[PDB]
């Protein structure tokens, strides 16, 4: 339950580097150094918020608490190690390896990235109508 | 918030700009999770009640929290930052 | 912070060290289905 | 071996029965410790 949560930070730093180099035109080594200043808060938050809800249950009681601690130790240590790795090793790999049917995806994604931005634009004017809808869900 | 503070931009303008630039990471980190718990959900045989019980909840929770957050969080970001 | 982008070796060493400290202790820990989660008990047997 | 008798070691014999494994891992970690210090992958040698 941590394999799809330990790569988050690593996947975030790698996406930024390539997004800061493809939309700008900088060399990998000079790109990472630029991207690492923009998301330290993001990566320094995900690990914190994700491993902070698993600490309070380590102090419960009964057989249920004994079951809880097994998840607690594992997920919390995984998040701490994930933070280090994606903030100590990830950069290096990015500044060394990252070089300076697939066609039908990028455009598709771009079209969906645009249509979604337009829909969000068409939603930030009628917050009252989107407030009752949310209430129903609760 | 960072883009507003250390960029001197408008509320809605920065909201749209951030939600546009932060969509590849959200989808990537969401599919890298939802696709990692199917081995627990579709499992069967030899102690598979535990795996199904563990994985089925988080699979649905991630699907919903990734298809509704991108549409709702700008709403109660702008309204909250506007009304306190 | 931005100090592991100039010397990759340092980062590689840290990664291997941690990997070597995990595999060395991966064959020393016990294996069980569950931890100890049942409440302990005590029994008093008599006769007549 | 006669009819039905057994063997059993005790004291020092039972203890000792029940080195390089922890010595080969100490020579590999010092090379990595040195490698990080010098950054050459040959300087450590």
Automatic annotation (TrEMBL), chain B:
The chain crosses the membrane at residues 26-46, 58-80. It is found in: Cell inner membrane. It comes from the Bacteria. Coiled coil: none annotated. Belongs to the resistance-nodulation-cell division (RND) (TC 2.A.6) family. This is Efflux pump membrane transporter. It comes from Escherichia coli. The chain holds residues 950 to 1033 of 1049 of the full protein.
């Amino acid at each position: 339950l941590a394999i799809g949560l330990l790569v988050d930070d690593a996947i975030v730093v790698v996406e930024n580097v390539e997004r800061v180099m493809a939309e700008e035109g900088l060399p990998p080594k000079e790109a990472t150094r630029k991207s690492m200043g923009q998301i330290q808060g993001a990566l320094v938050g995900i690990a914190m918020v994700l491993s902070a809800v698993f600490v309070p249950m380590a102090f419960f009681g009964g057989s249920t608490g004994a079951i809880y601690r097994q998840f607690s130790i594992t997920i919390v240590s995984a998040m701490a190690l994930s933070v280090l790795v994606a903030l100590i090793l990830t950069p290096a790999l990015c500044a060394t390896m990252l070089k300076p049917f697939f066609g039908w995806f990028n455009r598709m994604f771009e079209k969906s990235t645009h249509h979604y931005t337009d829909s969000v634009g068409g939603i930030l004017r009628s917050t009252g109508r989107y407030l009752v809808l949310y209430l129903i869900i609760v | 918030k960072d883009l507003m503070d250390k960029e001197g931009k408008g509320l809605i303008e920065a909201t749209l700009d951030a939600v546009r630039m932060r969509l590849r990471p959200i989808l990537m980190t969401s599919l890298a999770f939802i696709l990692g718990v199917m081995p627990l959900v579709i499992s069967t045989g030899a102690g598979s009640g535990a795996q199904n019980a563990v994985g089925t909840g988080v699979m649905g929770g991630m699907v919903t929290a990734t298809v509704l957050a991108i549409f709702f969080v700008p709403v109660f970001f702008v309204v909250v930052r506007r009304r306190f | 912070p931005n100090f592991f982008i100039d010397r990759p070796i340092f980062a590689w060493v840290i990664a291997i060290i941690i990997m070597l400290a995990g595999g060395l202790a991966i064959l020393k820990l016990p294996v069980a289905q569950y931890p100890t989660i049942a409440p302990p008990a005590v029994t008093i047997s008599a006769s007549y | 071996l006669p009819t039905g008798v057994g063997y059993d070691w005790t004291g020092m014999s039972y203890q000792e029965r029940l080195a390089p494994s922890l010595y080969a891992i100490s020579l590999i970690v010092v090379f990595l410790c040195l490698a990080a210090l010098y950054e050459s992958w040959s300087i450590p040698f």
